[PDB]
């Protein structure tokens, strides 16, 4: 059982059919920061709710997106592109 705050403007209907994909732990660390203080702003600008969790082994991070399917696909593509930028930046240095 996991309990999460949800805003008043996100309708309960859209909570159905979430989207799940995994990324690396450290990579999520530079994307969101150790504090995760930017998620509310990203949620408001995208009108979609995210959730970041860490597996016990600490290798994989599970990301879930709430919203209409086109919004979920768009957000997934954006995050994957940023992940590739950070991976290639790490490879450069």
């Amino acid at each position: 059982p996991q309990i999460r705050i949800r805003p008043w403007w996100f309708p309960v209907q859209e909570l159905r059919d979430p989207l799940v994909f995994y990324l690396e732990a450290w990579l999520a660390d530079e994307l969101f920061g150790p504090d995760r203080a930017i998620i509310p702003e990203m949620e408001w600008t995208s009108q979609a709710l995210l959730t970041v969790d860490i597996v016990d082994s600490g290798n994989l991070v599970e990301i879930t997106v709430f919203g209409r399917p086109r919004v979920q696909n768009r957000v997934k593509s954006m995050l994957l592109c940023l992940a590739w930028f950070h991976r290639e930046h790490r490879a450069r240095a």
Binding site: I5, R6, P7, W8, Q13, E14, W44, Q47
Partner: protein, 349 residues
């Protein structure tokens, strides 16, 4: 909805048949659309096209007279106002008529009313004020729970018009004592006071450093914030009911309460009638892209007009007098308010 004999959906008939089986005893209305790819309006044979069609698609029941309305399209909600409180609706579901609001904000105090409301252009705050109330309040909509964040004080004053400017962080209001006050949202402190006219000003319009005000005295005045220069007055023949400002070009639209519309320019004193009716115009609203405008009047009619000369593209009839209208930022949705109801139309072109 009401205009049609009976509004039905596609699953509604199957539900009815299954209910009949259990109990032992075009044609289908569509839902509103948001994605631009599904809009699919054929090319005529972002956009400045004049609209050509209307269709009613929902009805909102408020339980009392409706005084003001506001619609957001970035967030789908709609706002309705009455003498007892404000109700927030949602446009994401599918139903012909709705009775269950998304939220209700009541104001309980002996002899406390409401008259006005206003929604900010970024969809992050909402201004409320009325008679015999302590102060004008603002609500924070981006928070995970609705709550008041500031209070703009006014003692023994009865407001009737609100306006807000967001780039400079200012807020404006007019009171029945012929006084216009300015506030700063960073300090919640009074800045400058405008006074000198007893009748008050029913409508106020703010863009740049200019404040346009007009009322039953049949005059329109322009105030400048930078200096303390006296306002410039333009005399008319009848009493003004509402005002709006053209965003793209310098044109001020005003309704004369004798069924006559005019345009006035800030740069020079030119006038020319753009429409005439036998009713009294209670509101004029202007499209975000500036190519057309909507007008609602006393004689039970909603009309859409064309900018270059004022030709009316079409209109819609209604049973009860309408007193308010508002146009979305997508330029696709429009909301009016009559009787105890508010209806939502769609624009296709």
């Amino acid at each position: 909805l009401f205009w049609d004999k009976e509004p039905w959906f596609w699953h509604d008939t199957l539900t009815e048949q299954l209910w009949r089986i259990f109990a032992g005893v075009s044609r289908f209305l569509q839902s509103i659309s948001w994605d631009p790819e599904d809009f699919e309006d054929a090319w005529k044979r972002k956009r400045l096209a004049v609209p050509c069609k209307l269709e009613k698609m929902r009805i909102l029941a408020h339980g009392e007279l409706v005084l003001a309305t506001a619609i957001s399209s970035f967030t789908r909600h709609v706002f309705t106002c009455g003498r007892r409180g404000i109700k927030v609706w949602s446009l994401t579901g599918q139903v012909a008529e709705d009775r269950f609001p998304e939220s209700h904000l009541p104001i309980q105090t002996p002899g406390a009313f409401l008259r006005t409301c206003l929604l900010s252009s970024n969809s992050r705050s909402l201004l409320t004020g009325g008679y015999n109330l302590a102060s004008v309040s603002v609500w924070d909509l981006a928070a995970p729970s609705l709550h008041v964040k500031e209070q703009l004080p006014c003692a023994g004053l009865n407001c009737q018009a609100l306006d807000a400017n967001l780039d400079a962080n200012l807020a404006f209001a007019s009171f029945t004592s012929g006084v216009v006050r300015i506030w700063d949202l960073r300090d919640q402190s009074v800045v400058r006071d405008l006074k000198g006219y007893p009748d008050g000003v029913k409508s106020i319009v703010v863009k740049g450093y200019n404040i346009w005000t007009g009322g039953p005295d049949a005059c329109l005045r322009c105030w400048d914030q930078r200096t303390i220069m006296k306002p410039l007055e333009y005399q008319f023949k009848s009493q003004i009911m509402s005002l709006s400002h053209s965003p793209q070009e310098d044109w001020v639209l005003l309704g004369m309460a004798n069924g006559q519309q005019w345009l006035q320019s800030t740069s020079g004193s030119q006038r020319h009638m753009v429409g005439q009716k036998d009713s009294v115009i209670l509101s004029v609203k202007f499209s975000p892209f500036g190519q057309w405008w909507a007008s609602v009047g006393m004689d039970d009619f909603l009309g859409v007009y064309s900018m270059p000369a004022g030709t009316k593209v079409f209109e819609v009839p209604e049973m009860s007098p309408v007193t308010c209208c508002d146009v979305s930022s997508n330029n696709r949705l429009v909301v009016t308010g009559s009787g105890e109801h508010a209806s939502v139309y769609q624009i296709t072109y």
